[PDB]
XYZ file of C-alpha atoms in Angstrom:
703
model
C 252.239 -104.284 -86.973
C 255.727 -103.280 -85.590
C 256.885 -100.589 -83.112
C 259.538 -98.455 -84.824
C 258.893 -95.377 -86.872
C 260.468 -95.627 -90.383
C 263.314 -93.258 -90.527
C 264.507 -91.672 -93.695
C 268.203 -91.979 -93.059
C 267.698 -95.759 -92.531
C 266.047 -96.057 -95.838
C 268.805 -94.075 -97.478
C 271.477 -96.055 -95.592
C 270.295 -99.414 -97.040
C 269.089 -100.758 -93.876
C 266.091 -102.192 -95.768
C 268.027 -103.431 -98.881
C 267.852 -107.214 -99.479
C 271.001 -109.239 -99.706
C 271.063 -110.659 -103.312
C 273.305 -112.941 -105.363
C 275.255 -109.686 -106.414
C 278.750 -111.052 -105.663
C 279.968 -112.975 -108.634
C 278.197 -116.391 -109.438
C 279.299 -117.908 -112.594
C 278.509 -121.410 -114.134
C 281.478 -123.546 -115.090
C 281.584 -125.180 -118.635
C 281.395 -128.669 -117.121
C 277.794 -127.714 -116.347
C 277.670 -129.198 -112.799
C 279.642 -126.481 -110.883
C 279.529 -122.802 -110.481
C 282.073 -120.382 -108.863
C 281.574 -117.470 -106.466
C 283.824 -115.191 -104.502
C 283.555 -115.840 -100.790
C 282.066 -113.008 -98.616
C 285.375 -111.373 -97.769
C 286.349 -111.383 -101.586
C 289.438 -113.136 -100.319
C 289.075 -116.253 -102.434
C 287.136 -117.852 -105.213
C 285.340 -121.002 -104.325
C 284.088 -123.802 -106.570
C 280.563 -125.143 -105.734
C 278.639 -128.181 -106.749
C 275.160 -127.362 -107.919
C 273.581 -130.628 -106.851
C 275.085 -130.810 -103.452
C 275.986 -127.107 -102.769
C 279.349 -128.403 -101.212
C 282.428 -126.030 -101.613
C 284.441 -128.671 -103.643
C 287.602 -126.744 -103.319
C 289.006 -123.104 -103.137
C 290.270 -122.303 -106.628
C 292.248 -119.291 -105.521
C 292.824 -117.453 -102.270
C 294.859 -114.530 -100.886
C 296.085 -116.563 -98.125
C 297.681 -119.418 -100.203
C 298.540 -117.773 -103.504
C 302.326 -116.915 -104.329
C 303.339 -113.320 -104.830
C 300.028 -111.727 -104.265
C 300.280 -108.110 -103.853
C 296.562 -107.279 -102.748
C 294.353 -108.353 -99.898
C 291.009 -108.525 -101.799
C 289.655 -108.968 -105.321
C 286.600 -107.250 -106.861
C 285.962 -109.673 -109.933
C 287.387 -112.898 -111.483
C 287.128 -115.025 -114.606
C 288.013 -118.672 -114.876
C 289.517 -120.032 -118.064
C 287.699 -122.975 -119.714
C 290.354 -125.479 -118.325
C 290.828 -123.815 -114.847
C 294.494 -123.312 -115.594
C 294.273 -119.678 -115.285
C 292.160 -117.283 -113.322
C 291.891 -113.433 -114.039
C 291.737 -111.487 -110.890
C 290.490 -107.851 -110.916
C 291.552 -105.215 -108.512
C 291.339 -101.410 -108.171
C 288.300 -101.078 -110.389
C 287.347 -97.745 -111.682
C 283.994 -97.257 -113.120
C 283.688 -95.352 -116.328
C 279.861 -95.302 -117.246
C 276.992 -97.505 -116.254
C 278.555 -100.884 -117.363
C 282.230 -100.179 -118.372
C 285.169 -100.191 -116.128
C 288.945 -100.533 -116.179
C 290.931 -102.428 -113.637
C 294.268 -103.816 -112.492
C 294.104 -107.348 -113.847
C 296.321 -110.350 -112.652
C 296.824 -113.680 -114.054
C 296.659 -116.375 -111.400
C 298.447 -119.470 -112.807
C 296.679 -122.210 -111.053
C 299.144 -125.015 -111.621
C 301.979 -122.887 -110.120
C 299.958 -121.376 -107.501
C 301.416 -118.009 -108.826
C 299.810 -114.506 -109.034
C 301.267 -112.497 -111.869
C 300.286 -109.517 -113.857
C 298.181 -110.196 -116.920
C 300.544 -108.083 -118.765
C 304.018 -107.086 -117.840
C 303.057 -103.488 -118.698
C 301.690 -101.657 -115.688
C 298.329 -100.216 -116.576
C 294.610 -100.756 -115.987
C 292.889 -102.672 -118.748
C 289.256 -103.388 -119.947
C 287.323 -106.334 -121.165
C 289.899 -109.157 -120.777
C 288.499 -112.101 -122.663
C 289.952 -115.613 -122.686
C 290.251 -117.705 -125.817
C 288.136 -120.714 -125.867
C 291.230 -122.798 -125.081
C 292.085 -120.766 -122.081
C 295.602 -120.099 -123.477
C 295.191 -116.532 -124.637
C 293.588 -113.293 -123.201
C 292.433 -110.518 -125.479
C 292.130 -107.277 -123.652
C 291.780 -103.518 -124.168
C 294.314 -100.958 -123.080
C 294.471 -97.322 -124.128
C 291.657 -98.096 -126.803
C 293.864 -100.763 -128.422
C 293.610 -104.525 -128.485
C 296.279 -106.751 -127.013
C 296.401 -110.550 -126.821
C 298.390 -112.078 -123.973
C 299.594 -115.614 -124.766
C 300.491 -117.757 -121.860
C 302.167 -120.499 -123.634
C 304.903 -118.317 -125.022
C 304.910 -115.816 -122.177
C 304.284 -113.075 -124.791
C 301.987 -110.261 -125.548
C 300.907 -109.379 -129.112
C 299.515 -105.965 -129.953
C 296.509 -106.323 -132.259
C 295.725 -102.658 -133.145
C 297.761 -99.535 -133.149
C 295.338 -96.683 -134.011
C 293.399 -96.562 -130.827
C 292.971 -92.960 -129.380
C 290.935 -91.708 -126.603
C 287.653 -89.843 -127.615
C 288.398 -90.764 -131.192
C 289.162 -94.438 -132.169
C 288.043 -97.523 -130.095
C 288.998 -101.128 -130.760
C 286.778 -103.758 -128.990
C 285.502 -101.359 -126.416
C 282.445 -99.183 -127.308
C 281.472 -95.519 -127.174
C 279.243 -93.979 -124.717
C 275.879 -94.506 -126.500
C 276.606 -98.143 -127.545
C 277.334 -98.821 -123.903
C 274.381 -97.107 -122.516
C 271.708 -97.862 -125.118
C 272.657 -101.126 -126.709
C 274.073 -102.501 -123.477
C 277.361 -103.556 -124.979
C 280.863 -103.073 -123.636
C 282.657 -105.777 -125.546
C 282.612 -106.053 -129.305
C 285.464 -108.652 -129.395
C 284.981 -112.458 -130.123
C 287.144 -115.396 -130.490
C 286.562 -118.174 -133.143
C 285.901 -121.704 -131.483
C 289.139 -123.082 -132.849
C 291.307 -120.016 -131.289
C 292.298 -118.917 -134.753
C 290.572 -115.637 -135.150
C 289.820 -112.679 -132.800
C 287.079 -110.730 -134.456
C 286.431 -107.053 -133.404
C 284.395 -104.009 -134.133
C 286.261 -100.736 -134.484
C 284.153 -97.646 -133.486
C 285.268 -94.347 -134.985
C 283.911 -91.637 -132.776
C 286.116 -88.870 -134.159
C 283.292 -86.890 -135.907
C 280.658 -87.230 -133.115
C 280.253 -84.102 -131.129
C 281.628 -83.802 -127.604
C 279.980 -82.819 -124.403
C 282.060 -81.125 -121.684
C 281.204 -81.268 -118.027
C 282.924 -78.917 -115.642
C 284.257 -80.798 -112.611
C 284.768 -78.736 -109.492
C 285.979 -81.014 -106.647
C 289.498 -80.144 -105.099
C 290.566 -77.999 -108.176
C 291.895 -74.557 -108.381
C 290.488 -74.258 -111.902
C 287.617 -76.454 -112.974
C 288.453 -79.344 -115.332
C 286.210 -80.705 -117.977
C 285.150 -84.194 -118.374
C 285.104 -84.603 -121.958
C 283.558 -87.493 -123.949
C 281.690 -87.976 -127.264
C 277.780 -87.807 -126.992
C 275.581 -87.847 -130.122
C 272.246 -86.111 -129.486
C 269.186 -86.999 -131.432
C 269.954 -86.816 -135.199
C 273.609 -86.183 -134.772
C 276.656 -88.301 -136.196
C 277.154 -91.699 -134.361
C 280.367 -93.638 -134.442
C 281.275 -95.277 -137.779
C 281.783 -99.067 -137.132
C 284.063 -101.417 -139.081
C 284.312 -105.115 -138.545
C 287.849 -106.856 -138.529
C 289.230 -110.235 -138.092
C 292.688 -110.770 -136.696
C 294.330 -114.121 -137.572
C 296.479 -114.992 -134.523
C 298.844 -117.351 -136.631
C 299.363 -114.768 -139.388
C 299.315 -111.806 -137.081
C 297.360 -109.857 -139.830
C 293.947 -108.234 -139.906
C 291.268 -108.222 -142.606
C 288.218 -106.114 -142.964
C 284.632 -107.436 -143.483
C 282.438 -105.647 -145.983
C 278.953 -105.873 -144.679
C 276.039 -104.936 -146.920
C 274.592 -102.326 -144.556
C 274.127 -98.553 -144.470
C 276.881 -96.229 -143.576
C 274.940 -94.998 -140.645
C 273.980 -98.384 -139.302
C 274.844 -100.016 -136.124
C 276.623 -103.225 -135.018
C 275.390 -103.729 -131.510
C 276.698 -107.165 -131.113
C 279.211 -109.729 -132.776
C 279.795 -113.234 -131.612
C 281.318 -116.318 -133.111
C 279.108 -119.293 -132.637
C 280.297 -122.854 -131.776
C 281.310 -123.497 -135.324
C 284.845 -121.965 -136.122
C 283.420 -120.951 -139.550
C 280.506 -118.748 -138.306
C 281.061 -115.160 -137.112
C 277.555 -113.878 -136.194
C 277.116 -110.097 -136.778
C 274.145 -108.264 -135.611
C 273.313 -105.124 -137.441
C 270.611 -102.588 -137.300
C 269.676 -99.641 -139.441
C 269.622 -96.116 -138.229
C 265.806 -96.147 -137.933
C 266.130 -99.294 -135.878
C 263.181 -101.075 -137.593
C 265.383 -103.522 -139.661
C 267.405 -105.969 -137.602
C 269.660 -108.228 -139.892
C 272.062 -110.858 -138.581
C 274.883 -112.152 -140.857
C 277.066 -115.045 -140.525
C 280.641 -114.375 -141.905
C 282.946 -117.019 -142.739
C 286.323 -115.763 -141.157
C 288.452 -116.810 -144.122
C 286.492 -115.938 -147.136
C 285.035 -112.880 -145.442
C 281.776 -113.499 -147.157
C 278.683 -112.500 -145.193
C 275.581 -114.393 -145.427
C 272.160 -113.051 -144.355
C 270.687 -115.487 -141.659
C 267.954 -113.607 -139.837
C 265.838 -110.484 -140.624
C 263.361 -108.876 -138.205
C 261.489 -105.902 -139.495
C 259.087 -103.909 -137.403
C 256.551 -101.186 -138.285
C 258.004 -99.083 -135.534
C 261.242 -100.513 -134.102
C 263.118 -103.621 -133.198
C 264.114 -103.600 -129.593
C 267.874 -104.090 -129.368
C 267.739 -105.842 -125.965
C 266.426 -108.654 -127.829
C 269.430 -108.511 -130.289
C 271.775 -108.631 -127.357
C 269.945 -111.462 -125.715
C 269.682 -113.752 -128.891
C 270.900 -117.111 -127.803
C 272.848 -119.452 -129.894
C 272.428 -123.268 -129.729
C 275.175 -126.004 -129.404
C 274.743 -126.958 -133.221
C 274.777 -123.392 -134.580
C 271.113 -122.384 -134.715
C 269.563 -119.992 -132.265
C 266.657 -118.714 -130.178
C 265.328 -115.329 -130.752
C 262.611 -113.228 -129.356
C 260.637 -111.177 -131.830
C 257.568 -108.894 -131.305
C 256.380 -109.675 -134.781
C 252.852 -110.784 -133.728
C 252.345 -108.153 -131.238
C 253.831 -109.731 -128.217
C 257.300 -110.784 -127.383
C 257.741 -114.486 -128.206
C 260.384 -117.074 -128.766
C 261.349 -118.342 -132.190
C 263.776 -121.297 -132.932
C 266.059 -121.337 -135.904
C 268.624 -123.744 -137.523
C 272.172 -122.437 -138.617
C 270.829 -121.761 -142.140
C 268.303 -119.338 -140.692
C 265.320 -121.640 -141.123
C 262.703 -120.831 -138.442
C 261.563 -124.512 -137.584
C 259.638 -124.123 -134.305
C 257.809 -121.175 -132.855
C 258.183 -121.686 -128.909
C 255.810 -119.321 -127.193
C 252.358 -117.913 -128.083
C 249.585 -115.873 -126.405
C 248.532 -112.517 -125.099
C 251.592 -111.986 -122.814
C 255.335 -111.148 -123.229
C 258.405 -113.074 -122.747
C 260.697 -110.868 -120.570
C 264.118 -112.959 -120.772
C 265.477 -115.747 -122.730
C 267.984 -118.011 -120.840
C 268.696 -120.765 -123.413
C 268.108 -124.079 -124.941
C 269.454 -127.271 -123.405
C 270.884 -130.306 -125.114
C 267.364 -131.847 -125.254
C 266.006 -128.797 -127.104
C 264.157 -127.694 -124.110
C 263.852 -123.828 -124.092
C 264.186 -122.028 -120.711
C 262.781 -118.537 -120.381
C 261.174 -115.876 -118.111
C 257.847 -114.212 -118.877
C 254.839 -112.082 -117.573
C 252.429 -114.849 -118.547
C 250.957 -114.720 -114.996
C 250.611 -110.929 -114.961
C 252.410 -107.887 -116.290
C 253.302 -107.272 -112.580
C 255.129 -110.688 -112.211
C 257.785 -112.728 -113.621
C 258.111 -116.507 -113.633
C 260.681 -118.925 -115.170
C 259.419 -121.480 -117.679
C 260.535 -124.524 -119.477
C 259.128 -125.604 -122.845
C 260.329 -129.049 -124.086
C 260.693 -130.198 -127.692
C 257.143 -131.793 -127.532
C 255.725 -128.286 -126.776
C 255.075 -129.129 -122.968
C 255.300 -125.946 -120.879
C 256.130 -126.126 -117.130
C 256.301 -123.153 -114.864
C 259.456 -123.803 -112.885
C 258.985 -121.051 -110.397
C 257.367 -122.250 -107.076
C 256.633 -118.865 -105.514
C 254.630 -116.063 -107.142
C 256.155 -112.607 -107.402
C 259.339 -112.073 -109.449
C 261.799 -114.950 -110.307
C 265.061 -114.815 -112.215
C 267.376 -117.612 -112.818
C 270.990 -118.248 -113.652
C 271.275 -121.709 -115.252
C 274.195 -124.215 -115.015
C 276.121 -124.962 -118.154
C 273.882 -127.964 -118.933
C 270.623 -126.310 -117.755
C 270.162 -129.180 -115.356
C 270.320 -126.660 -112.339
C 269.768 -122.965 -111.725
C 270.185 -120.403 -109.002
C 266.908 -118.574 -108.725
C 266.334 -115.275 -107.075
C 262.661 -114.823 -105.838
C 261.059 -111.864 -104.379
C 257.618 -110.315 -103.935
C 256.304 -106.940 -102.962
C 256.046 -108.279 -99.459
C 258.972 -110.721 -99.422
C 262.682 -109.882 -99.937
C 265.063 -112.076 -101.888
C 265.088 -115.687 -101.645
C 268.059 -117.097 -103.599
C 267.723 -120.767 -103.819
C 269.145 -123.671 -106.039
C 266.813 -125.794 -108.211
C 267.215 -128.875 -110.317
C 265.267 -128.310 -113.588
C 263.796 -131.672 -113.975
C 260.639 -131.574 -111.809
C 261.375 -128.015 -110.647
C 262.903 -129.294 -107.441
C 264.182 -126.756 -104.868
C 267.277 -128.215 -103.434
C 268.324 -125.636 -100.874
C 268.365 -121.807 -100.075
C 271.547 -120.003 -100.223
C 270.005 -116.764 -98.900
C 266.546 -115.854 -97.712
C 267.114 -112.604 -95.822
C 266.092 -113.632 -92.156
C 267.447 -110.643 -90.695
C 265.731 -108.143 -93.130
C 262.504 -110.042 -92.534
C 262.882 -109.601 -88.795
C 263.769 -105.785 -89.271
C 260.661 -105.534 -91.402
C 258.488 -106.972 -88.613
C 259.982 -104.442 -86.225
C 258.743 -101.403 -88.171
C 255.504 -99.851 -88.682
C 254.638 -99.776 -92.411
C 251.499 -100.424 -94.455
C 251.889 -103.012 -97.447
C 251.734 -102.007 -101.051
C 248.307 -102.688 -102.118
C 248.016 -103.604 -105.813
C 245.053 -102.715 -107.873
C 243.925 -101.017 -111.106
C 243.242 -97.359 -111.608
C 240.271 -96.904 -113.833
C 240.574 -93.772 -116.023
C 237.984 -91.681 -117.630
C 239.507 -92.617 -120.982
C 238.768 -96.304 -120.110
C 242.091 -97.708 -119.474
C 243.053 -99.917 -116.691
C 246.376 -99.136 -115.219
C 248.296 -101.514 -112.872
C 249.039 -99.677 -109.734
C 250.002 -99.810 -106.017
C 248.938 -97.759 -103.023
C 250.495 -97.374 -99.721
C 248.056 -95.733 -97.236
C 249.218 -93.554 -94.506
C 250.023 -94.774 -91.032
C 246.924 -94.152 -88.909
C 244.711 -94.314 -92.028
C 241.364 -92.900 -91.323
C 238.890 -93.416 -94.120
C 236.907 -90.302 -93.022
C 239.954 -88.046 -93.569
C 241.367 -86.371 -96.680
C 244.956 -87.254 -97.340
C 247.484 -85.814 -99.797
C 248.839 -88.194 -102.441
C 252.206 -88.389 -103.891
C 252.291 -90.131 -107.245
C 255.396 -91.906 -107.965
C 256.387 -92.916 -111.591
C 259.103 -93.456 -114.282
C 256.970 -94.018 -117.348
C 259.693 -94.781 -120.042
C 259.265 -97.114 -123.016
C 258.909 -100.783 -121.747
C 259.546 -99.816 -118.188
C 257.535 -100.668 -115.133
C 257.387 -99.386 -111.545
C 254.270 -101.453 -110.592
C 255.880 -104.806 -110.047
C 255.301 -107.548 -107.576
C 259.000 -107.393 -106.501
C 260.584 -106.389 -103.296
C 261.426 -102.742 -102.759
C 261.418 -100.638 -99.470
C 261.889 -96.987 -100.456
C 260.905 -93.559 -99.204
C 257.157 -94.204 -99.747
C 257.153 -95.518 -96.157
C 258.782 -92.571 -94.862
C 256.113 -90.421 -96.469
C 253.324 -92.659 -95.623
C 254.447 -92.170 -91.917
C 254.015 -88.418 -92.325
C 250.393 -88.685 -93.421
C 250.719 -89.079 -97.181
C 249.154 -91.598 -99.403
C 251.652 -92.822 -102.023
C 250.453 -94.255 -105.335
C 252.336 -95.667 -108.314
C 250.653 -95.962 -111.692
C 252.189 -97.577 -114.891
C 250.689 -95.751 -117.876
C 250.675 -96.279 -121.647
C 254.178 -96.955 -122.888
C 255.176 -99.351 -120.125
C 256.293 -102.970 -120.436
C 254.788 -106.509 -120.220
C 251.352 -105.602 -121.576
C 252.303 -106.230 -125.216
C 253.846 -104.391 -128.098
C 250.900 -101.975 -128.817
C 250.887 -100.985 -125.211
C 254.499 -100.117 -125.233
C 254.975 -98.648 -128.756
C 251.745 -96.695 -129.017
C 254.012 -93.758 -128.013
C 256.138 -94.103 -131.120
C 256.985 -90.627 -132.515
C 255.275 -88.725 -129.727
C 257.014 -89.574 -126.439
C 255.486 -88.292 -123.173
C 252.164 -87.284 -124.585
C 250.223 -90.409 -123.615
C 252.368 -91.047 -120.491
C 251.450 -87.474 -119.291
C 247.784 -87.984 -120.213
C 247.743 -91.117 -118.132
C 249.375 -89.889 -115.128
C 246.951 -86.780 -115.312
C 244.018 -89.141 -115.716
C 245.158 -91.528 -112.885
C 245.586 -88.496 -110.697
C 242.077 -87.362 -111.584
C 240.547 -90.805 -110.759
C 242.512 -91.128 -107.453
C 241.377 -87.703 -106.596
C 237.772 -88.871 -106.685
C 238.452 -91.401 -103.792
C 236.808 -90.103 -100.777
C 239.868 -90.482 -98.531
C 241.898 -88.319 -100.807
C 242.190 -84.615 -101.047
C 242.131 -83.761 -104.864
C 243.732 -80.312 -104.291
C 246.793 -82.183 -102.822
C 248.055 -84.575 -105.511
C 251.756 -84.538 -106.502
C 253.995 -86.369 -108.737
C 257.578 -87.558 -108.449
C 259.931 -88.930 -111.010
C 263.575 -89.331 -111.941
C 265.099 -89.414 -115.531
C 262.146 -90.223 -117.782
C 260.002 -89.851 -114.767
C 261.349 -86.382 -114.190
C 260.389 -85.533 -117.714
C 257.055 -86.996 -117.205
C 256.685 -84.871 -114.116
C 257.353 -81.599 -116.030
C 255.011 -82.824 -118.791
C 252.222 -83.516 -116.338
C 252.553 -80.034 -114.548
C 252.683 -78.498 -117.913
C 249.754 -80.352 -119.606
C 247.484 -81.341 -116.729
C 245.882 -77.739 -116.387
C 246.653 -77.682 -112.559
C 245.719 -81.278 -111.781
C 249.002 -81.641 -109.741
C 249.673 -79.314 -106.917
C 253.272 -80.069 -106.787
C 255.949 -82.123 -108.640
C 259.479 -83.266 -108.248
C 261.646 -83.834 -111.385
C 264.975 -85.414 -110.855
C 267.398 -85.385 -113.725
C 264.553 -84.724 -116.211
C 264.941 -84.587 -119.959
C 263.492 -81.397 -120.956
C 263.314 -81.971 -124.761
C 264.330 -84.986 -126.838
C 266.584 -82.874 -128.933
C 268.974 -83.036 -125.914
C 268.935 -86.719 -125.354
C 271.212 -89.303 -127.087
C 270.939 -90.874 -130.621
C 270.069 -94.438 -130.037
C 267.568 -94.113 -127.383
C 265.721 -91.060 -128.599
C 265.617 -92.107 -132.364
C 264.330 -95.620 -131.430
C 261.146 -94.117 -130.249
C 261.118 -90.794 -132.271
C 263.131 -91.133 -135.417
C 265.458 -88.161 -136.142
C 264.558 -84.447 -135.558
C 264.581 -83.749 -139.326
C 262.116 -86.523 -139.958
C 259.779 -85.819 -137.084
C 259.571 -82.088 -136.155
C 255.882 -82.431 -135.108
C 256.574 -85.216 -132.769
C 259.604 -83.524 -131.179
C 257.564 -80.441 -130.826
C 254.507 -82.422 -129.205
C 256.877 -84.187 -126.956
C 258.847 -81.163 -125.588
C 258.279 -80.205 -121.923
C 260.627 -77.215 -122.508
C 258.302 -76.095 -125.162
C 255.306 -75.955 -122.734
C 257.259 -74.768 -119.698
C 255.324 -71.421 -119.574
C 252.257 -73.577 -118.979
C 253.666 -75.053 -115.634
C 251.179 -74.982 -112.867
C 251.933 -76.078 -109.231
C 255.060 -76.139 -107.224
C 258.130 -77.591 -108.839
C 261.211 -78.991 -107.364
C 263.754 -79.582 -110.141
C 266.999 -81.329 -109.355
C 270.150 -82.400 -111.244
C 273.612 -83.390 -110.856
C 276.333 -80.938 -112.156
C 278.159 -83.715 -114.012
C 275.453 -85.833 -115.501
C 276.660 -87.602 -118.599
C 273.368 -89.170 -119.335
C 270.749 -86.402 -118.975
C 272.760 -83.218 -119.443
C 272.444 -80.476 -116.943
C 271.498 -78.431 -119.932
C 267.975 -79.943 -119.821
C 267.426 -78.561 -116.241
C 269.239 -75.301 -116.997
C 267.054 -74.643 -119.971
C 263.796 -75.459 -118.413
C 264.467 -73.284 -115.417
C 265.213 -70.207 -117.723
C 261.764 -70.865 -119.377
C 260.189 -70.726 -115.889
C 262.118 -67.575 -115.106
C 261.049 -65.815 -118.290
C 257.349 -66.883 -117.683
C 257.544 -65.668 -113.981
C 256.879 -69.013 -112.602
C 258.450 -69.613 -109.164
C 260.195 -72.888 -108.401
C 262.707 -74.730 -106.375
C 265.868 -76.123 -107.747
C 268.962 -77.933 -106.573
C 272.124 -78.680 -108.397
C 274.360 -81.392 -106.670
C 278.094 -80.719 -107.391
C 280.081 -83.184 -109.473
C 277.233 -85.739 -109.242
C 276.028 -87.813 -112.223
C 272.693 -89.253 -113.263
C 272.515 -91.431 -109.871
C 273.065 -88.305 -107.681
C 275.019 -90.093 -104.875
C 278.325 -89.916 -102.893
C 278.696 -89.610 -99.183
C 275.757 -87.794 -97.670
C 274.243 -86.912 -101.087
C 271.292 -89.276 -101.254
C 270.089 -88.612 -97.719
C 270.544 -84.794 -98.275
C 268.312 -85.148 -101.519
C 265.646 -87.344 -100.225
C 265.513 -84.960 -97.032
C 265.165 -82.032 -99.453
C 262.417 -83.875 -101.334
C 260.568 -84.901 -98.290
C 260.706 -81.246 -96.925
C 259.700 -79.961 -100.226
C 256.611 -82.102 -100.079
C 255.807 -81.129 -96.479
C 255.963 -77.513 -97.409
C 254.270 -77.584 -100.766
C 252.030 -80.760 -101.019
């Protein structure tokens, strides 16, 4: 009911963005405390879970000796608190990876030192279990800093940029398997295991970079497109005492993946997660670090594919069994195993998906997140060893938790479509809310000040007889007797969702203030509706997703307050692709579309992602053909705005360049924008505001 008009620059400036836990919360091994940087990132503070008191400041800029910087950006505390790593001068590499200036704060001496007496940014510094050593990556080699002897030992010598990586991971493993760190220490501190990724034979992509250069310079990196050579991976154990390395022979294929390794809490068990190239056979081995003998411990085979996020999220139990989420039975559910691989208790059941696995406490209580309430929502649950399930979340919407070491407490983040983040601390027994760390008063008051309509959730019924979760924001002085344009907003990728009872305040409300209905529909292929719903697209991406947006548009179009001749579609990345597909396959259903950094053809996208859902080009020529937007470009109808960054390392500019040329040769008019030196997130300075303005204006002129 507020007074102020929603302004596009305010959206784009983050004025509506909720304050979150973002900054740095980490549970301590004692289980009763967590650490967190203060607001100014000038100190690291230790907090009691139960009381929330700041027990002490573990490190500060003010007090520390010989501290050359005024702020930190990240930290890590050693298991004993004798050493704290401090990270400054962070440089992002890709989505997750970064390098940094890393210092060792010697707690006992109140002294800041360099981690290494070699000046140079490093990656992935990882304490040994005893806190006394730090393995880190520099220049693609592994080093171990040893605090007891004030010495650094060099573990590998063959590291080489764009060729050989030790511990760190290649572009595609980082992006698609979610793994930046393939090093792991034994529980007794005797071994550092690592994966060596050989990227030498993987093809390169080159991106011309233009800023402030007389001659352009290429950002060059290895990127395997669908069906091309991936890194070859090898597993090694370095024995700290002997300063010698051994290789592990794994009984897997030469084009397989090792997306994770991790020593368990037994010093004798190196867990190695492997996946074949088709990604339908997940096998985990335990390797004994002295005999080097691998033993198969878990195997998960799927008709279509095993989802590697569940490989990354597999949780070991104190007492070396583990909890694993498998889609075996048609939904994502938790299974509990001993250290011999014996599956002794299935934990969850029913027609709904587990969405996150937190862990298993000392009483065998299993803690997780699921969409049991609705595909649209997320709640945290506990299932104890007698099979009793308690929903721990107190509010309905989206809940996600970070548990203390013992799982006796957790920091919960809650939001709903209507309500921005409430970060509050709970005691697990009795699901008792202790206090609230943040509940965004200010943003709530700002919201009340503005005129906007709420997201109204519902289902879109298609002629094909699907029911698609959806939201709708009506225009500002909504008059049922009028005929409004609709913008359909979507992403549509495998297992993704845009229709979520979760807080978000984006340009939908700007457009709503200018007379547009905005709708968001999650079609086939999307998450939290079970395996079949998400994998029915297998080997034929985009077909069903297009069909469904076209079908959803067709139905929305029959609403009396909607002008069927003015329905548009917007999407970014897979959403961009889905836009192209929908304009190409909908026989003029959409009047306009915006396609931001779209894949044009799955041939152009990367190995691990594309093949998961499509297999290789050689094996699926029909699928790749059916799924190509580029192939059907000459069928495009409606007004298109297509946009890309010039330096997009994820969805290559190539996609957009090629699609536009198809349009040109078919005499199809369209708008395009290429943002210089920008990547897949198209931002920097005024870039987002300029882009969203462009997009809004394009809709005002064409929709």
